[PDB]
From a paper:
Interestingly, structural analysis suggests the binding of itaconate into the binding site of B. abortus isocitrate lyase. The ligand is stabilized in the enzyme by salt bridges involving the two carboxylate groups of itaconate and residues Lys183, Arg222, and His187. A network of Hydrogen bonds further stabilizes the ligand inside the enzyme. Interestingly, this docking pose places the carbon atom of the reactive double bond of itaconate in close proximity with the lateral chain of Cys185, suggesting a possible nucleophilic attack by the thiol of this residue leading to a covalent adduct between isocitrate lyase and itaconate. We observed that the growth of the ΔaceA strain was much less affected by DMI than the wt strain. Complementation of the ΔaceA mutant with a plasmid encoding ICL renders it sensitive to DMI, which demonstrates that itaconate acts via ICL to inhibit the multiplication of B. abortus under our experimental conditions. In striking contrast with the wt strain of B. abortus, CFU analysis of lungs from infected mice showed that growth of the ΔaceA strain was not affected by Acod1 deficiency, demonstrating that ACOD1 control of B. abortus in the lungs is indeed dependent on the expression of ICL by Brucella. However, aceA deficiency does not prevent or reduce Brucella multiplication in the lungs, demonstrating that ICL is not essential to Brucella multiplication in this condition. This suggests that Acod1-mediated ICL-dependent inhibition of Brucella multiplication in our murine infection model is not explained by a simple blockage of the glyoxylate shunt or by the toxic accumulation of propionyl-CoA.
The ACOD1 enzyme is mostly produced in mitochondria of macrophages, and converts cis-aconitate, a metabolite in the Krebs cycle, into itaconate. Itaconate has been described to act via the bacterial enzyme isocitrate lyase (ICL) which is part of the glyoxylate shunt that is exclusively found in prokaryotes, lower eukaryotes, and plants. This alternative shunt is activated in response to nutrient deprivation, a condition encountered by bacteria in phagolysosomes. On the whole, our results support a model in which the ACOD1 enzyme, via the production of itaconate, restricts Brucella replication in murine alveolar macrophages through a bacterial ICL-dependent mechanism.
Numbering used by the authors:
A (entry chain A): 3 to 426
B (entry chain B): 2 to 425
C (entry chain D), D (entry chain C): 2 to 426
Write the structure that this text describes.
């Protein structure tokens, strides 16, 4: 069966999960040798534990390894990897793009590798200091964006494998047309048929199976706002097609949007994913409850995911008490993975704009204020004021000393200004 | 033929007082047979040259991403600093976190310079397409970039200089450390190379700029204020600082008397082979900065200087508020025309995300809404990234799509976006 | 109102007969506020334009590495072909071996074009420093490169076009396949997009060249000879070929009647929006090539055409030796002015190393010495890489070192090399 | 106390005779808190360890691409060599052509090792999915890879070792040259580092493997046969070879008496800290190879040695045909159990494409059809790449598509391909 093919999968991991392929297909397609993907195994099993043990798992979108390291240091238990942020400031074309699948398909997995490598160094630093870790683990699970798979089922298969090699714990795929892909909160989205998205989800599961990892799959539907559909071939989509409207010049069908096609698609996708996610136009607890209840009528207890999107104007949509309870209330509905997709972008850009403005106005006064804020945050667990230790200078000092039997004349920390000027 | 005919964009006087070990005919022999233009490198170098002569001083912050650089320019800063320390920490081509020891691959700095220029390019495209003029003097603020110790010998310095020119950097700095033992200026264990050996690296950088045909600026850095080791006493200019009583180390290094005296001697020896001179210092000391400038200007009147306002200093520990507030202005009057906070982008990024993540853990969406409200508040001072879809170019690419389709595209993004509906 | 003023290096008449969906004011609006030069793209596009109008025909081989391209130029070929199939096989930015289905990341083709131009650049630097003139007309032979199906929609085609221009490509080809189901021209299971949709891709590529300011050539390819599937019948130009009795597939694809007739129709529709037209074919057939050329020229007299001399054909199975020998010459006379063997680099690389490895297993150094002697024997025909230290620039970087050091370096490489000692004539 | 528990896949006796500067507690302190497996590195190192103790000798060729490595394995070679010279020439992460002087970025060699393993993985997937067993003993032939002079100091050697292990290399070689003046072994101007300094690099590499938990092989290389310069005389083991009367060069280098004697002394000093020892030589000379082996074996009986069968030698100028034919066999009996032609991939690629391009210029499709017919004729000896669609995995991805769709995909590629139609047996 499939548990034999995925040895690290915990008991019950695939309860309720259907597959288009067989276990014999997996053995036929996985090659003749066992290659381990340790960070993917550990991350997927830790993510599986967390979303079932916590009241909910909340995360922020990280655009760099350092951002992810501070998220874990502050006590967050998972990391979100946003394709929007990859497009904006962290992709393999070295360009700034809007969120339209314009960057090359390897960019997401390359960012996941960067994040895991930073977490790996943070763990090496603390392990070498010999006083225990300052966190439960540095290897918080990464839930990562595979957009619409960058093409067809074989493209979804490849990006899933790439994320697994990079050490991602879960990967999400959405029912948009890859050639017209959009941020969930932009106009002009085009859906693919329900069956076509199920093929991408099955492609992602086959990839995890042939890699031997229990990687989580998140199915996302964009049907709340999308008014276009590539094809009406699937009888499940036809009730929503406005036939009197005719097709667009591109050949797209026009559909009725809203929660109703999201519920239908979510229920159809449920056997083929581990969590379900519906993009929404507004942060709306009542709408979130309606979606959860409808999904759970067909699929009791199904795990759900919710994008707490910065594309919403929060204090305009909601009062303060609702903002404060929002994630707790979603958690009780069954949204066990909640994430702020663009948080890293907004933090990075705001923080540097304000520092640069203060620097232009007051020069070193502005920077000393940041440094003093850093000092004040050390009581709350912040450590990066001592930047030489933070990036591993002490760790590599210890590597050098082990190589040289203690005798190297060129170690870094002893006579550093960090040691001299940042003493506790 | 002289060097001005080989570098067509060089302004009058660009090379006054500059000496070269090679000839103009060497440059013709070594540059290939076809003219290749490096437009951004030309523009940046000439803008940097004008700025450092006309401004009281040019101050910059170290940027670790294109978005950080974009906000620096938007806030009104006139130049961008590219720190090799930050490349090592969070932005290199080995996708690892490193201490500042030249551990990452030699292409990483130039790759980051290219990312920065690409983000600025898109920022300029967005505003140009909107048709209301630029909100900045120029988006292409000159980049002064870190080439460390050249990543080997003179040929390696030659190659990294060319790579930075291709990436569009305006100025590049090289230091007199041993590449195999390179350190951050404020770490211990630095090893100097002979004065003559660093002059070879600087000549290699100048030959690279000459054969690329660009008036790229060269900054010569000396680490002799703190370095206590030297690879070889072969150069008679270094022998007066060698502690021959101490004998050599187990690795064969000579021990040297460090401090401002060997910095002054090396700076005066380097001066004809660079455009700015930089001495790393252990403390932010205006009296020491004045003594260095006065000594250099005795031998080379009017020589432009650079100064590292390093986060490796504990600023309030060394200086009172009045001295911090006047620090850069007083340095500028001494001749320090380029001043930069090397690790500013690292500290801003890590502090900001630690504090957001900590608040998010404790209070979930209340913490994010506080950030969003701060962003809205900053718009009166020029911040724009709250509208993140515009910021990354969604409106620009909407305009591209409309030009392609003669106006008939059914799938543009901004019109029905939540940004348009919720961020007025 | 003039595009020539937006493209300073375009020669007189470059855009005769070329239509654009966008205006010159659109270009000015979308190109940013500063002029960035793309010198190798300018030089290559203009050299390619001259070549295809002055030579009887320009033939090329698919190069999968800079070294392959260098030897092509050294041997006297005037252009270089960059194959996406070979990128997928052995030279892509996912570091994987892929079949030809647009599975690799969209930057891989431009990155290979940059590698090729960098190798040619070093070859030119070596000979320029030696001071005895070049051994070729130019090292910077124009590169015609594969943008497959644009890797998505028109904006993706726009982006890969810009990337190829930055990398210094001279011409770029785009095909009317669905990128999510893209195939090699000679595989089954190809899915066409509507005629109008491919015209949008071609216009996006022209807009990219325009905003970059370069007269880069655009090649339009149709896969309609063999493709039996089509995403949508929305375009009335495609409806005459839709098999409505067969119905749609489970994916919703329309089934179409493939062959020469839809190729001719699509080619004539694409012609105002490209510089060369190319139809993939199932066999190397001179008669079919003439029929396609004649039909296109009935609508667009003198239109430049391109032809894939594909290794996916079994050549001696299809043709006798006399027809093989005259094949490219006859095509050139019909108007096929750019002809290319797509997978030549793959077959040369894999055949050559299989045979060397087999001989090495059998006979060890005897097999390698046979290669080295063959290299020596080819020097009379212009081969130089036997002296591999010179070939990769060791002498050039010696000259760099000597200019840096005033002539007095203890660590120059060539003087005491075994190359200088053992490879003298 | 024990290193075998830290390296779980290490076979019994793997570290016999091996000394370490560091302790087992150092490894535990420096390796992080989680077990990460490096499966290809384990399998390759253990297979290479087996091969060099069971074969008469293991011979290899330098591969510059995954496709080259795939054909080496298909032809029956049992290991793959990865040359930094070839990385510099045509396969590095700066996308430039370089002479062999450590000019490219330090990640380039490991990136090529990853490419090679990925191609081999696809080859194995193809044959596994076809269900008829493999056509080779294994597709995962061990890779022995070039780490040059470590790209800096001991910490740089530590990092490049880890990168090769992540990429799945089986063994890695490090040489006693100054990284800032690094040369190909057969160029002039080499500069040695002190004996103690190279031992520190070797120890850094072993610490890297220890913390990664892999039994990766380490090859120590000495360049003292031709190097006439030395950075420092601080090590008393080097002082007997320093020409003190000559003084230091202008750069501060000591001048040394080169030849076999400093190679023997350095090799004997390096032996506890590596698994194989390699001395670069100026000529392919069996007598010098025997003198070196006999002297190393007087101090370290049974020590395994490596030998570069370099294309930088003019083989027929140095040696008669009989000596060429027995060369590797004779070296094997002396203890040279890993033998490799460093630049074989460069010479095969460049010679093959020059001769193809020359014939194409002269005779167009006749030249290519000759290659294709040669390919057909090589199929009886096991060549398969004439069917290029199968070779790169098109049939494998067809099977993936059919598994995803339960047999229903309309867009599979092989059934109606020209390969199936025109390349039938
Ligand atoms: C752009 C979306 C996120 C996504 O991944 O679609 C948003 O606005 O949060
Ligand atoms: C590490 C230095 C900067 C540098 O580039 O050396 C510092 O502490 O500012
Ligand atoms: C795979 C084709 C080439 C192409 O680019 O489609 C062939 O067989 O030549
Ligand atoms: C350049 C050498 C090989 C090496 O790796 O040094 C040769 O000529 O074989
Ligand atoms: Mg996304
Ligand atoms: Mg630095
Ligand atoms: Mg192709
Ligand atoms: Mg080498």
């Amino acid at each position: 069966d499939f548990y034999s093919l995925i040895p690290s999968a915990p008991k019950g991991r695939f309860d309720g999960i259907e597959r288009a392929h067989t276990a014999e297909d997996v053995k036929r397609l996985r090659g003749s040798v066992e290659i381990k993907y340790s960070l993917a195994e550990m991350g997927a099993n830790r993510l599986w534990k967390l979303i079932h043990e916590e009241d909910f798992v909340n995360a922020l979108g990280a655009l760099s390894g350092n951002q992810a390291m501070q998220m874990v240091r502050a006590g967050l238990k998972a990391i979100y990897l946003s394709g929007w942020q990859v497009a904006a400031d962290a992709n393999t074309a070295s360009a700034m793009y809007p969120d339209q699948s314009l960057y090359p398909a390897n960019a997401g997995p390359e960012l996941a590798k960067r994040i895991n490598r930073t977490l790996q160094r943070a763990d090496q630093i603390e392990t070498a200091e010999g006083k225990g870790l300052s966190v439960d683990t540095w290897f918080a699970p990464i839930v990562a964006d595979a957009e619409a798979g960058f093409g067809g089922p074989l493209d979804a298969f490849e990006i899933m494998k790439a994320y697994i090699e990079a050490g991602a714990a879960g990967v999400h795929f959405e029912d948009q047309l890859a050639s017209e892909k959009k941020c969930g909160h932009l106009g002009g989205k085009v859906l693919i048929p329900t069956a076509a998205h199920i093929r991408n989800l099955n492609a992602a599961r086959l990839a995890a199976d042939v890699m031997g990892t229990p990687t989580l799959i998140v199915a996302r539907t964009d049907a709340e706002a999308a008014k276009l559909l590539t094809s009406d071939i699937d009888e499940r989509d036809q009730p929503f097609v406005d036939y009197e409207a005719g097709r667009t010049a591109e050949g797209f069908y026009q559909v009725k949007n809203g929660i109703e096609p999201c519920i239908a698609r979510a229920i159809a996708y449920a056997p083929y994913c581990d969590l379900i996610w519906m993009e929404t136009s507004k942060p709306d607890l009542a709408q979130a409850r309606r979606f959860a209840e409808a999904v759970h009528k067909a699929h009791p207890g199904k795990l759900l995911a919710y994008n707490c999107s910065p594309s919403f104007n929060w204090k305009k949509n909601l009062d303060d008490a609702t903002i404060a309870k929002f994630q707790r209330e979603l958690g009780a509905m069954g949204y066990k993975f909640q994430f702020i997709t663009l948080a890293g972008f907004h933090q990075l850009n705001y923080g540097m704009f304000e520092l640069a403005r203060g620097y232009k106005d007051r020069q070193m006064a502005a920077y000393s204020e940041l440094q003093q804020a850093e000092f004040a945050a050390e009581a709350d667990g912040y450590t990066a004021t001592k930047h030489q230790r933070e990036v591993g200078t002490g760790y590599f000092d210890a590597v050098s000393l082990a190589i040289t039997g203690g005798q190297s004349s060129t170690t870094a920390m002893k006579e550093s200004t960090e040691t001299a000027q940042f003493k506790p």
